[PDB]
Every structure is written in C-alpha cells, then in structure tokens.
Amino acid sequence: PDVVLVNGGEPPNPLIPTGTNDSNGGRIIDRLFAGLMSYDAVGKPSLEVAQSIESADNVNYRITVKPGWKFTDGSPVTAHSFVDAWNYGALSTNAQLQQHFFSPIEGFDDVAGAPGDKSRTTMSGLRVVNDLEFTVRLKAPTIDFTLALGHSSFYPLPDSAFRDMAAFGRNPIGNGPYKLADGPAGPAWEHNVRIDLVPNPDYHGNRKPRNKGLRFEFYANLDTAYADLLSGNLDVLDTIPPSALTVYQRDLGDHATSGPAAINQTLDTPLRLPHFGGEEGRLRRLALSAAINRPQICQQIFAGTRSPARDFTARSLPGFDPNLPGNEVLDYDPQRARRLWAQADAISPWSGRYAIAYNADAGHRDWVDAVANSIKNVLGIDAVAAPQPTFAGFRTQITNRAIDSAFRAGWRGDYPSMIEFLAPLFTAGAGSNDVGYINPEFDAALAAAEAAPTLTESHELVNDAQRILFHDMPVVPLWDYISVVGWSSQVSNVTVTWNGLPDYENIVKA
Amino acid sequence: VVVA
C-alpha cells in the first residue's frame, strides 16, 4: 500500500469548508483546499494563494491573488472564488457553522442577524477590485484577522459549488495539495469506513505532498486502531488510547512522540436542561467544576498526558497565564461544591439524573466514567455516563439540540490564539456555542481584546475577559492535551503540529 | 474545530 494510512472519523457534515466546525471533517477539508495563507507545523502563516495581504491598521485589507491557480475541475481560482465563498458563509440563510469567522467584516450585520427582510445577501465591506484583487473593511481593528486567513472558513470555492451546494458537499472540488481519489473499487468516500485522497497534480503551493496519497480510516474503536498500528496495518495513529498509555513507550520506542498540543476538553451542560439555567444553573456549573479532581484524573486516567485546565483556552497558546485571579473555580473542593449545589437547591431543589454523553470512538470512556463518579460521590446525585457510538452522530445531536443531557466537548485550535478558543464557543451567536451561553458583557470584553493594537495588550484583555467566564462557568474546563502520536515502521518524517495533528503532507512512506 |  503506497498510500499513508492514518486515523480519522466520519465527518458529521458535508465537506463544505464554511459548514465544517469539527476535526473529522476538518482534517479532510484541509487536505482538499488551499487558502490565502497556509500554516506550518507551529501554526505560523505564509502566503499561499495570496500574492500579498496588506493592512497597516488591522481594519483595511488589500488582498491580491496569485495568478494561475485552479480547482481540480480546471476552473480558475479568482477573487470571486474567495468573496463568493465568504459571503456564502456569512449569510444566515445558508446556516453555515463557521459563520462567526466573518463577524469582523463590515456588512456582516446586514447578512447575519437572520435571513431577514434585510434584502442584502452580501457584505458591503468585501469588495472585488479586479479578477485577482479584493479589499476587506472590518468594523473595528481585529488583531487576529490576518492570522485567521489560513483557516478553512476562508477557503475559495469553484463556481459550480454555488449552483448546488448539497452536491458539492457530497463530492467537493478544491484547489489544495490532495483531491478525492478516483477509486478503482468504489467511491473515494465510503461513509463510516474511510476516505481516500491522492495528490493533486495542479498544486504547486507550500504544502506539496511527500507521499502518494492518504487513506483516513474511520475507526469505530481506538483499541482496534492501536492494534493495527502495532501490526503495521495503520501508519499513523494521532491518539493513543487510554488502555495503551502506560505501554506505548515500550511498544513503540522512538516511533512515538509526545508533547503539549493546543487542544482542550470541557464538560458542557446546556442551559436549557432542567435545573441548569439562570443563576441556579450558574451555581450548579461552579459546583460541578469544584467536584472534579483534574490533577488526579490527569495522573491516573491519562497517565500524565493531560494537564489540568487553568483557564478556558490551552496552556500552549501565546499569552496563556495559569495563575489568573479567580481561577480557583477550577480547583477541586468538595465542601465548596456541596455549598454551591445547595445554594442552587435554594432556588429549585435538584431532581433527576445527570448524564454525561460522549462519543465512544475516541477513548473517552475512562475519564467520563471517572468524572461522573466524582460528581456522584461529591454531590450525592445520580450521575452517569451515556456513551454514543460515533462522533458524527453525537455532534449531530448536539448541533440540532436533540441531545438531552450534558456532554463532553473540546476545542482543537485552528490557529494559535486564545481569542480563537473563546469566540467560537462562548459568544452569543457562534455556531459552536453548544450550550446556549449568552453574556453580552463577555462578548464586549472579547471584542475589546480583538481591538487591541498589540498582542501583549490583547492577551491582557483576553484574560480580563476570562474573569467573566470564571464567574459564569459557561462550560466546565477540564484539561488540555499532551498529544501522543505513534507511527509504523513503514513511514518517517512524521511531525506532530502545534494542535496535535500529523503534518500529513510531509509524511514519507517507503 | 470541535475535537473528537
């Protein structure tokens, strides 16, 4: 098998960049497209499809597109390929999960509040100048906007996409380093089984593949994946399962690497659930946080491969501070947890069951069982785990709001910015706000951080904003990741990126 | 992205 075999999972949603907010779809999307910038293994952006990106003020942007780029259907990548895709993502009528990434652009409010009788379908701040040039006017200085231009929300789309976006999402056509295979025995995307990609011969950008293709195998169980790794039937496994964390070093030797990654994990309890809204719900979320022993779970369940949360972002990000005032809400304190739960009971006495739903295909069983048992023992309530088989179905129930319990969540960074760990999850309208948290004061504080002229002041304002999150506990931050990645004896040049994923394009296979 |  010339192709590199790596682990993945069925995407919950069609393969439309602005419609993808999860890592299963994301790891495919990022192989199929090339954006204005591309990111290296440490998350630094470089010009890719853009010939230049100019802004002196973080408000006005002039973007020129390199000539000669095309999609795999032969059509050219133009300024329109970007502007039309961004307007599609921003328009509320299209219900794109990545809509919030367009929020800084002037005119976003015309298209995003709702479908509306607004009569406007495009953003006034986004203006084509010529076939290979467009300008962007932001509502306010936005410190991360340039950095974000390597993210999938901003990928260009071919003209055909807009005539039938459902068809596009089933069979995407991109401009990136790989393309969907022309499989010799069935479709490239075998739903719930695998996706096969081959190099795109048109592509001459910054991420040229060093291998002959990629096969993302959609494992139902990470123990199966680990067994395949040890037998050489899998080439790269980006998540060693809990059952192997005390053993992977002896099993794999120098074919496994570990390190902090900008990924976190949270316990999400929708504010719409019984006993979990209003001030009552805030007190109960604070109680849950005090009822969980993060150091102990990190040591025993994860064998030291998770680090207890100290904020709502991740230890490895620029500006992170593990000693923020008020972060004591993230310390284990059973007496405090019981006091807070009782104070919530003063509003309305608790009744029923507290269930933590999770996707069993990614090794969460041990920690969810431990957290549920900790809550049960500290607070004296009926707390249980509620496994579901697949990430795709689990996320679908979270997104459509069918899910009727608490559930695990967590963010893998898209670019290295604390703001990017907060805006998609906790601002009022964000598509990845799974719990219905709304606090206009937090959104305002975060906007102030985005408007800072320097990264230093911006980081200070981000952490100021996180004081509100310590008070509201919109979700319960658990820990951030020490990624552990293993690979077979048939591949080399395996680098783990800043956000825990293999650097797929650069893997080599003899 | 939301993580598996």
Numbering used by the authors:
A (entry chain A): 32 to 541
B (entry chain F): 1001 to 1004
What wording appears in the published article?
The components of the Mtb Dpp transporter include DppA (R3666c; substrate-binding protein), DppB/C (R3665c/Rv3664c, integral membrane permease proteins), and DppD (Rv3663c, ATPase). The substrate-binding protein DppA associated with the Dpp transporter binds heme with high affinity.
Surface plasmon resonance experiments and difference absorption spectroscopy showed that heme-binding by DppAR179A was almost completely abolished. The DppAR179A protein yielded crystals of excellent quality that were used to determine the 3D-structure to 1.25 Å resolution. The atomic structure of DppAR179A is identical to wt DppA with an RMSD ~0.11 Å. The observation that mutation of a single amino acid strongly reduced heme binding by DppA without affecting the protein structure demonstrated the specificity of the interaction. To examine the role of heme binding of DppA, we expressed the dpp operon containing wt dppA and dppAR179A in the Mtb Δdpp mutant. While the dpp operon fully restored growth, the dppAR179A gene did not restore growth of the Δdpp mutant with hemin and human hemoglobin as the sole iron sources in HdB minimal medium.
